[PDB]
């Protein structure tokens, strides 16, 4: 049986299992729990045999595809990494370890075939499969051949077969169910009710608009406001000891703000398309260009890598980045417009007693879904 207070790990005998023992070691050091790394023969065959009885390793390392049957046989626990951790890994890897919508393993490595060419014999490798016969007829003249690879395993021949539209099984990509809208479920009620309770007790005030908030906070007239980076500069100019922290919790759950990516689109009816492409690529989305905008109003965590690695040292950006990981990125589907529209008049009517919280959110559901 699996021993509590200790980690046993299985991994194939052709992997860097000694280096893994090193890692399990630094772990045993800092926490005082031994980590043994083993590599049994036929481990892909042995694991489901013993893990069914309650035995086996705590962690097992194998190619992701074999994990589907493991999860089918109830041998793998569902994996619970936060959004902060999932960002660290590539998104397609998380798809390789999803079975029945649940994450069942941590991806480690990525494997794929490549074209390997002889620099001496072929310093300019071909870019199209079509130009290999011509290259071969030429290379055959010097007693050589252009291409030789394993033809007896479909793992090696599939890249060519799959190029023009072959596939094993069709994978339906991710999407938003525009018929499953959640603006009148229990959680949405508790939130909006709480906000409308904050005005039934005079703690807030209904027609408080954007400018009233900026003025009142930048006059030491209120203890806190909620806003994004663009409004930081005017609080510098107001000389106020402002801090930027994580949003408060509601019912022990963090506030989930919608995350926007400021974006620049080129109009389709513009005759000056290339000049706009030149302005954004070579003047704005540059280290010097983004700084020009950022010193007017703070941009946030920019998309350009170079400049972001500099602004990331700002503790308030890392606070903004922290709050972004607690929230969701916004969809870009056309129905986003009807959602914002509906929720807007829901919050207002509920906030001014024009409609009850329940009735306002109820009307918001239909308007977000059918329009």
Ligand X SMILES: OC[C@H]1O[C@H](O[C@H]2[C@H](O)[C@@H](O)[C@@H](O)O[C@@H]2CO)[C@H](O)[C@@H](O)[C@@H]1O
Contact partner, 289, from a second copy, ligand X, none, Cβ < 5-8 Å per class: a second copy
Mask for 233-252, x = binds a second copy (CB under 8 A): x-x----xxxxxxxxxxxxx
Instruction: Please give the structure tokens belonging to residue 339.
Output: 């959602």
Q: How far, in Å, CA of 300 to CA of 225, rounded? A: 17
Contact region with ligand X (CB under 6 A), list: 23-31, 115-123, 152-160, 238-246: 152-160
Residues 70-109 that bind a second copy (CB under 8 A): 70, 72-77, 79-81, 85, 87-90, 92-93, 95-99, 101, 104-109
Q: How far, in Å, CA of 325 to CA of 301, rounded? A: 12
Residues 253-282 that bind ligand X (CB under 6 A): 260
Q: How far, in Å, CA of 74 to CA of 90, rounded? A: 26
Instruction: Please give the structure tokens belonging to residue 45.
Output: 């065959």
Q: Is 43 in the site for a second copy (CB under 8 A)?
A: no
Indicate the angle between helix axes 336-351 and 186-200, nearest 10 degrees: 40
Q: Which is nearer to ligand X, 63 or 134 (CB)?
A: 63
Q: How far, in Å, CA of 57 to CA of 48, rounded? A: 11
Q: How far, in Å, CA of 10 to CA of 95, rounded? A: 23
CA 109 to chain centre: 18
Q: Is 330 in the site for a second copy (CB under 8 A)?
A: yes
Half-sphere exposure (Cβ direction) of 55: Cα atoms closer than 13 Å: 7
Residues 291-330 that bind ligand X (CB under 6 A): none
Mask for 18-57, x = binds ligand X (CB under 6 A): ----------------------------------------
Residues 267-296 that bind a second copy (CB under 8 A): 267-273, 275-281, 283-285, 288-290, 292-296
Q: Which is nearer to ligand X, 111 or 177 (CB)?
A: 111
Cβ proximity of 102 and 72 under 8 Å: no
Give 43-51's long-range contacts (Cβ < 8 A, gap of 24+).
Answer: 43/10, 43/11, 43/12, 43/13, 44/12, 47/10, 47/75, 48/73, 48/75, 51/75
Contact region with ligand X (CB under 6 A), list: 27-35, 50-58, 61-69, 73-81: 61-69
Residues 100-129 that bind ligand X (CB under 6 A): 111
Contact partner, 43, from a second copy, ligand X, none, Cβ < 5-8 Å per class: none
DSSP letter, residue 174: P
Cβ proximity of 283 and 289 under 8 Å: yes
Q: Is 69 in the site for ligand X (CB under 6 A)?
A: no
Q: List residues binding ligand X (CB under 6 A).
A: 12, 14, 63, 65-66, 111, 153-155, 260, 340
């Amino acid at each position: 049986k699996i021993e509590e207070g200790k980690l046993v790990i299985w991994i194939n005998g052709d992997k860097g299992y000694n280096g893994l023992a090193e890692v399990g070691k630094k772990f045993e050091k800092d926490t005082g729990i031994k980590v043994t790394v083993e590599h049994p023969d036929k481990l892909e065959e042995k694991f489901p045999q013993v893990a069914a009885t309650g035995d086996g390793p705590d962690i097992i390392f194998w190619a992701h595809d074999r994990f589907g049957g493991y999860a089918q046989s109830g041998l793998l626990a569902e994996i619970t990494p936060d959004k902060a951790f999932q960002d660290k890994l590539y998104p397609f890897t998380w798809d390789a370890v999803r079975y029945n919508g649940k994450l069942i393993a941590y991806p480690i490595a990525v494997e794929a075939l490549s074209l390997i060419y002889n620099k001496d014999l072929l310093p300019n490798p071909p870019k199209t499969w079509e130009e290999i016969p011509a290259l071969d007829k030429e290379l055959k003249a010097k007693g050589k051949s252009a291409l030789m690879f394993n033809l007896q395993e479909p793992y090696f021949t599939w890249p060519l077969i799959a190029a023009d539209g072959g596939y094993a099984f069709k994978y339906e990509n991710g999407k938003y169910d525009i018929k499953d809208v959640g603006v009148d479920n229990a959680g949405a009620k508790a939130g909006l009710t709480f906000l409308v309770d904050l005005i039934k007790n005079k703690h807030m005030n209904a027609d408080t608009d954007y400018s009233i908030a900026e003025a009142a906070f930048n006059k030491g007239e209120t203890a806190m406001t909620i806003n994004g980076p663009w409004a930081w500069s005017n609080i510098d100019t107001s000389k106020v000891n402002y801090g930027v922290t994580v949003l408060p919790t509601f019912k022990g759950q963090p506030s989930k703000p919608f995350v926007g990516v400021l974006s620049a689109g080129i109009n389709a009816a513009s005759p000056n398309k290339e000049l706009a492409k030149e302005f954004l690529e070579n003047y704005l989305l540059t280290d010097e260009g983004l700084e020009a905008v950022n010193k007017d109003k703070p941009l946030g965590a920019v998309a350009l890598k170079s400049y972001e690695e500099e602004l990331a040292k700002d503790p308030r950006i890392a606070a903004t980045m922290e709050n972004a990981q607690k929230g969701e990125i916004m969809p870009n589907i056309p129905q986003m417009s009807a959602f914002w529209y509906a929720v807007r008049t829901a919050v207002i009517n509920a906030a001014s007693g024009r409609q009850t919280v329940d009735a306002a959110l109820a009307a918001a559901q239909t308007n977000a879904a059918a329009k």
